[PDB]
Design a protein around this nucleic acid. Structure first.
Lengths: 260, 148, 200, 126
RNA sequence: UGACCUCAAAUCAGGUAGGACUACCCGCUGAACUUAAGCAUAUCAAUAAGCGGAGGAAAAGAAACCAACAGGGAUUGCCUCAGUAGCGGCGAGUGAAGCGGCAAAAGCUCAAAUUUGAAAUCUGGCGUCUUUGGCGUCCGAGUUGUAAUUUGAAGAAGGUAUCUUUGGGCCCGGCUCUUGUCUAUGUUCCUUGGAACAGGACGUCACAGAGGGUGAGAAUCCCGUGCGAUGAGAUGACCCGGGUCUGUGUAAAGUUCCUUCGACGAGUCGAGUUGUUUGGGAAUGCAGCUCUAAGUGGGUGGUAAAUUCCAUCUAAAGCUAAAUAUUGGCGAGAGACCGAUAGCGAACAAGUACAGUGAUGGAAAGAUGAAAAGAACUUUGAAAAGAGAGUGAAAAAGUACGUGAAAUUGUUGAAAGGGAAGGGCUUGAGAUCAGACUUGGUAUUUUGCAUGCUGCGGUUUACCGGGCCAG
RNA sequence: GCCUAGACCGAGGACUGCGGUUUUUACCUAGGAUGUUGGCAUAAUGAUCUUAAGUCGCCCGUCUUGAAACACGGACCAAGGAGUCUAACGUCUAUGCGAGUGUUUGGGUGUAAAACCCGUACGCGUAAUGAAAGUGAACGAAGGUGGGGGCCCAUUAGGGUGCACCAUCGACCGAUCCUGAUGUGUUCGGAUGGAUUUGAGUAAGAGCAUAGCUGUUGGGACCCGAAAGAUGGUGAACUAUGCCUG
RNA sequence: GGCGAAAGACUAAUCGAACCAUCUAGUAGCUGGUUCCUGCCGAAGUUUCCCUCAGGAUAGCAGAAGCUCGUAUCAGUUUUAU
RNA sequence: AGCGUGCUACUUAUACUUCACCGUGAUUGCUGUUUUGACGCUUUCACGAGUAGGCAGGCGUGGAGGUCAGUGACGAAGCCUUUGCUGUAAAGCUGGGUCGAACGGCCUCUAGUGCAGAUCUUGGUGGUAGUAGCAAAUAUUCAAAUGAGAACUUUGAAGACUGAAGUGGGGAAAGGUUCCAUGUCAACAGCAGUUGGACAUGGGUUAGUCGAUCCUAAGAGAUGGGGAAGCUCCGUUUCAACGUGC
């Protein structure tokens, strides 16, 4: 708010003894504003309680390594079909994930050709989902340049840009990203894992250089892919194993019998 | 987040957690460190002994660059050796050829003598060493070279 | 006003500080416009580099003796050694510092070699130089082309030479000598006149 | 999406620029598409409407109505056709104000300046 | 009778100053509330108010610097130093700088020198030309010193070996700015609707699916958007890329070594004292007063003094872009901002109406409809109005205009009511609501469908089984 | 021991149990209600609202030992209306990396305040102690004793090893006090050995960063509230006094 | 500050120090208020110091987070002995 | 139906006993049947007062990221309502009516986020209540006209009063069109109104001689000067070379 908002008055309290509350009041006469309360957060025309300041904290720091941890985790989640379906993508007609397309897709120049490529690879149902999901936003946000809301489509990740970005520029809901610069705002929209990512073969090949491997060192300085604290992520299969079941005691009933 | 604060939970209860008798006021007790010798003495004596008074001599225009002398112990001295040649150095080192460790070029002022060294000759370059640190270095067959 | 086991704070906010709060919302905008200024300046003077060549000097004080950094300008002696007049040198991208002198030889030699490396790669155009030759050149970054490099710290293997006197004893003796230099000089002098006046 | 930094996506700025447009700027706003026949006779798809053009109404209660424009009531952002009148219970008729975006021009009023405009826009006038 | 000096006059010729703005800037002057749980030093604060002065930035600025190192090297800003050294009723509080990393980088000009074989200099008048000016001429300024030459980093005068480098103007481009013009694809079909911009079908364009408008959610109806293309006008000793004409280069500038020299700012430095200020503490700066220098002199080296060294600069004269600031002005773009008691005091003929002698104080007030189509006409009435009618999708939209809450009120209906009323619990009465003959199954008949009898509502007593309430 | 009258309830939901009768791999009264009959389904039943009756019930908020108070605020209704943000911190929790840690002052890049990338310094940590000059952490398996989860060997027990941590006695570094070797710019040096002394120390590092609740301090500081003080201005149209002219 | 045949009178309904705007949201150990539900736990008016006595700091009482363990040795109690 | 005393039965607390249900704490078991919920299911036992205060789990509001290819002009949101249902509750959902353009659920984020009070703020509306009251200035009445309408307008007749220090006739200050004619009654004239200083439309102020203009008064105040950092202060012919002379 403005620094002087609610404080452009010369009001003084009348004190006590005049049968009115001790709030400051506008002086003078002849207007209906005269004698009215002022300066208070309870008063009409006063200033709000704790007026907002610009030196509030707006940006937040995140450790760089933690941010890279999250980027890697989202990239990994993009290859889990249950997570992509839970995320909300129409990927039931894509045979396997990840979806990798030949590099000829990096060179398309017309939106018609790019849309045909999306149709061919089975990623167009999700574009149509985006088209159909357009609605007017609820609330006063539509008075502030946020008038319409829609879904997020597939994310296209490339290695060389030969017009793929401008070709897919106008397709609604489809985002493009270089493999070199992948950020969390595209990989996990709304903090929900499982973006629908379409890789080119160039980007898919460059992934191993970008994030390294047991044989390849990351281009990122001093960066290694993180290590899970568990080695086998299927615990039921671990429990029902010869190693464990050969030492456990026999199991009781699922439910105790009421004996009294 | 304001929604997880207790202000949102105190809504509806009269005093906002401040008590009905105490009546949260502006500044009971004073502002800042008021009354440190009069009515806050019981706190300063208990938790901050030594607070009042002068000790020692002043030092006009103290330049902290003069007193720069970071320490490195002997148990950490072999980390200053290049990592990839550490194992090779630890094996073949002898009085005819021992690794040279310039502690000054790594940002250290004085070599202190905590810990034990590998039984390996070394040539240590430092601006300063402690008495015990230099005794330990010569005990493994090394030497200290003073630099400036 | 003073309660519990807490650190005692020095928060200097008793003046009208809220009138002098400077929030750097324009950090990104300043970065972008700084880059635009840099681009315009580079494009104006191409292929001539945007930076003047700077010398390499020792950082002052006992804390930063080890480090070596970029100086302001080559001394008049350093330019004298490579035969460049300072007035001329300022016109071919070599910075000049009339204030610095060379007491030592190491810094002087390093900067002379730096000047020679620069002068070898310098191609000075003229009226006869045509647009094609100038077009065949690329605007380099002088600072990156001639980076300031720290001298290599001592490593490797060397023969071990053990003096009889320890380094600790050497430092103790140096401290003691410095501490008592004045009093010993006074004592020795007054003894000298005592034994040179009563023995006359 | 808009790319130019000189173009504003503000709703309030857009609406202020429309309702406070001058009569000269309102001339371009009140453009009407040409009929399919003229769009090949001239090879131009739309023109600022003019007084003596003939238009066919394509939207609204008066769809299918034909007539020559009478006035480009620029203040009201509208045009009035010859016989698109509503009668009051008084018995007097008032013109019905149609927006030029809801008509098609079936015949142009062609003079020296219009033809240059048609030639300018890549079309053929004469 | 004449010069000179000093001082005047003129509606003399030609110029210049003032005032306005306020966000930032440069100075002066200068509080108190407040904190110290009292209060006087202190703090607030070297701040507010007051006065003077500017610019697009200002200021500062090319060391009488920092240091104490192997030394750095004009100024400014950031990060850090550092809540540190220090100051402080050593209380409350307060509080820098050097170094280092970076942004930006740019350097210079006078006085003090005999041109002395030539005041070589400059304002003005007059004349002329091709006019931000050139050329000629005449007065005037000026020797109590205007030009050329040098600025300490040097430099000068001689001698020296040769070498190296080079002035101006016009004409078109480029770059910067402003601005004009030009550009893809459905208004196809059906349903609802007053209106299709809605739903469904089939599509099309897309470097354009930002935004706005149009009678409801419009990429494809319009303007734009995206992509660019092409004109015009500016602007730039102090940007370059070219032509073209003049280049008066026996010129100027630099470069090596030698010799001799090498002018360097005074009521100033410095000292005492007083006051203020500072982190500056036997005194950080500033100012007043008194005293008042020197020529390897002078300043600084954060504890006063003397003795001896060392290091480092060279004051008392001056100019200078960029990096930095910006609640003002001009022009733009945005937002997890407000949404008409909010947001600026002001979404409206708002600093308006109005008050006050005056300084000053200072509101309330948005929304019919798509379109006034804003109710013709008849009737009762003095009229306002009413009743009909009419317009409209709607008059349960009539300008006392979207929706139209509560307080409060009218009418109707119900009910209760001996100096209050209202509440809980329990039941009665009245009203309202709910529920199993279940998606009930078993054979059954006709009514009904496009169809070649088949899913299955329909009916009544049988049979089986169920629901609920009771004995 | 036996007979006998009445009231309230029926949780659970295949089996598993303890018993009993055994005529029996059966049955039971023994780890919680079933059987049968009638009626109704246009209703018996249930709920709510309004009202009557019976009984109980003082007007809320507040300060207070004590409020229905003859204590204060409150005629009524709508809308607005009060623990916020920040700098620096303490504890705890989560996350990343870990003797390190922190990209975001800055540069590179960009689909342009985003995202992505880079690195020098610097901060905190890794060493303390002293006013300072200064000095600067292994006798030992980084010590001994008593416990100590867990693990190993046993076979109740018992034995071995025993991380964290607790109690305790020591060792090491700095300060203070004492002692004073070889020596020496003869006044310096300070080996060695000690001391009911002392430190926010060592004794196989635990931190750094971000976020969150809570608490603290300074800020208007949960909201409203003085009597005052200061700075710069406006008033002698009322009134006070003088003068001029009536 | 004025003015006062003096009442602390009068100085624009304002006078034992006018009015206007600002500093200023001045400070207040004092008064008043402080906005949803349920669950679980649940006080104190006492100690010492304070120009302290209508206030603080301190200890106590309370909550929360837990952590090391798993009957070890503990108790607003009795007995015996002293 | 008192007092002292004894006995028998009987009455009833939110206490005790048994049972049901809720929650909290502890506790049993559950992966070769873990099976798409192990932050779950499950067995058993005990317990339940509460201000100040603490903590936990939830309900609701404005806005943000994601998702429901969610609802909606065949009616969104809002509002009213014995239409009900769900939840201990905060609340959520629904039937009917009104209405006309947007709006919700779920996973997260965020905050100017929840009112009965503050002699709270702004706006609105009551009871009081058709009540207090509309009583100073001697005093009005008859008729006619106008008019829808006359205590109040006009005219006539009468009766009165101010009684020349006036309720007369002019002016200064102040006002500013109130002046005059025509028309007119929504508001105003605290009854009324055909009337008006109201409302609407027009018209109207004539100077050589009346004033101002000129003179000087108490005083104000430039200049030359002199102070003051300065805003400005003093001074009024003043330490002045003072004529826009005749």
């Amino acid at each position: 708010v403005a620094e002087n908002a609610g404080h452009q008055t010369s009001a003084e309290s009348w004190g006590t003894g005049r049968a009115v509350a001790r709030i400051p009041r506008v002086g003078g006469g002849g207007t209906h504003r005269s004698g009215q309360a002022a300066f208070g957060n309870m008063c009409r025309g006063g200033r709000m309680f704790a007026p907002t300041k610009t030196w509030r904290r707006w940006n937040v720091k995140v450790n760089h390594n933690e941010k890279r941890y999250a980027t890697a985790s989202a990239i990994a989640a993009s290859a889990v079909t249950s997570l992509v379906l839970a995320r909300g993508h129409r990927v039931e007609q894509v045979k396997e994930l990840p979806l990798v397309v030949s590099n000829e897709f990096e060179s398309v120049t017309k939106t018609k050709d790019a849309v045909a490529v999306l149709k061919a690879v089975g990623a167009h149902k999700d574009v149509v989902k985006v088209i159909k999901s357009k609605k007017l936003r609820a609330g006063k946000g539509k008075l502030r340049g946020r008038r319409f809301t829609q879904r997020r489509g597939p994310l296209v990740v490339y290695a060389q840009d030969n017009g793929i970005v401008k070709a897919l520029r106008n397709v609604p809901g489809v985002e493009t990203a270089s493999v070199k610069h992948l950020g969390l705002l595209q990989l996990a929209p709304g903090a929900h894992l499982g973006r629908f990512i379409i890789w080119t073969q160039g980007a898919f090949e460059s992934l191993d250089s970008v994030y390294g491997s047991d044989s390849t060192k990351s281009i990122k300085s001093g960066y290694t892919l993180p290590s899970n604290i568990i080695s086998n992520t299927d615990v039921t299969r671990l429990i029902n194993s010869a190693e464990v079941q050969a030492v456990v005691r026999p199991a009781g009933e699922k439910t105790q019998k009421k004996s009294h | 987040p304001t929604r997880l604060t207790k202000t949102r939970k105190h809504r509806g209860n009269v005093s906002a957690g401040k008590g009905r008798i105490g009546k949260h006021r502006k500044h009971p007790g004073g502002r800042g460190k008021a009354g440190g010798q009069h009515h806050h003495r019981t706190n300063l004596d208990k938790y901050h002994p030594g607070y009042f008074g002068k000790v020692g001599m002043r030092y006009f225009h103290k330049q902290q660059n003069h007193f720069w002398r970071p320490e490195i112990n002997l148990d950490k001295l072999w980390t200053l050796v290049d990592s990839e040649k550490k194992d090779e150095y630890l094996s073949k080192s002898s009085a005819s050829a021992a690794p040279v460790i310039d502690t000054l070029a790594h940002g250290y002022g004085k070599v202190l003598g905590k810990g034990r060294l590998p039984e390996v000759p070394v040539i240590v370059k430092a601006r300063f060493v402690s008495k015990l640190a230099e005794e330990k270095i010569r005990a493994v067959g090394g030497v200290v070279e003073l630099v400036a | 006003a003073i309660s519990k086991n807490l650190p005692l704070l020095n928060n200097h906010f008793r003046k009208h500080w809220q009138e002098r709060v400077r929030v750097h919302f324009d950090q990104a905008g300043k970065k972008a416009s700084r880059r635009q200024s840099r681009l315009r300046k580079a494009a104006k003077i191409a292929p001539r580099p945007i930076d003047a060549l700077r010398p390499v000097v020792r950082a002052p004080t006992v804390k930063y003796n080890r480090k070596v950094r970029a100086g302001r300008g080559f001394t008049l002696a350093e330019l004298k050694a490579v035969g460049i007049a300072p007035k001329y040198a300022r016109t071919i991208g070599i910075s000049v510092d009339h204030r610095r002198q060379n007491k030592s030889q190491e810094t002087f030699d390093a900067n002379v070699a730096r000047l020679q490396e620069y002068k070898s790669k310098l191609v000075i155009f003229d009226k006869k130089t045509k647009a094609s030759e100038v077009a065949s050149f690329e605007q380099v970054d002088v600072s990156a082309t001639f980076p300031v490099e720290q001298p290599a710290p001592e490593s490797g293997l060397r023969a071990v030479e053990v003096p009889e006197q320890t380094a600790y004893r050497t430092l103790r003796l140096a401290r003691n000598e410095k501490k008592y230099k004045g009093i010993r000089e006074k004592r020795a002098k007054e003894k000298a006149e005592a034994e040179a006046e009563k023995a006359k | 999406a808009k790319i130019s930094q000189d173009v504003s996506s503000s709703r309030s700025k857009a609406r202020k620029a429309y309702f406070t447009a001058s009569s000269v700027e309102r001339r371009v706003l009140l453009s009407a598409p040409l009929s399919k026949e003229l769009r090949q006779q001239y090879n131009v798809k739309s023109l600022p409407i003019r007084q003596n053009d003939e238009v066919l109404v394509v939207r609204g209660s008066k769809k299918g109505s034909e007539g020559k424009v009478n006035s480009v009531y620029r203040l009201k952002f509208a045009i009035q056709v010859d016989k698109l009148q509503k009668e009051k219970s008084n018995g007097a008729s008032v013109p019905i104000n149609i927006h030029p975006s809801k008509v098609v021009i079936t015949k142009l009023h062609l003079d020296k300046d219009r033809k240059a405009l048609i030639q300018r826009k890549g079309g053929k006038a004469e």
